[PDB]
Amino acid sequence: TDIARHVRAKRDGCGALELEGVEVCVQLDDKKNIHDLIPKQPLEVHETVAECMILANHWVAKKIWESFPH
RNA sequence: UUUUUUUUUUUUUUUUUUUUUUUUUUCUCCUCUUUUUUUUUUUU
């Protein structure tokens, strides 16, 4: 939690653009038919893991660019 | 006290052959309406 919160702190001191999408989820029972629909949401932990893997993939790409130029 | 005679079931067998699924019609034809076309992002 702390690590993610403050990787966020830094890379927003840089300043990202965090926006959203109009996404909805669907539950399907035994009969395979619509019990209900439910709007889904972005959760704190989604943001955490999103930034952890952003930084990860970022260092990955750095390594692999400086390692193989063209 | 009533003798004698009036044929019967066609003859024949020791002939060659080098093709081939099907088969043969039917004309030109007014697709109705918020749009450029949205787009990063993350959790599968």
Side-chain angles (χ1 to χ4, degrees):
Chain A
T1 302
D2 177 46
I3 297 298
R5 287 262 43 81
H6 297 77
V7 174
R8 167 281 295 165
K10 279 186 179 179
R11 191 181 89 70
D12 304 335
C14 305
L17 275 169
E18 61 88 20
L19 274 72
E20 291 170 286
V22 296
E23 298 90 12
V24 63
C25 73
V26 171
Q27 322 82 21
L28 303 181
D29 47 7
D30 274 313
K31 309 164 290 298
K32 183 69 49 205
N33 301 123
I34 299 175
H35 186 192
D36 63 304
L37 320 172
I38 289 295
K40 60 180 80 173
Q41 282 174 331
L43 268 74
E44 184 263 335
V45 305
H46 302 147
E47 305 165 353
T48 62
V49 66
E51 307 307 317
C52 85
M53 288 138 70
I54 279 162
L55 192 144
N57 297 293
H58 174 45
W59 287 99
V60 175
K62 296 154 86 144
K63 161 201 175 174
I64 211 68
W65 183 19
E66 287 84 4
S67 298
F68 274 99
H70 301 275

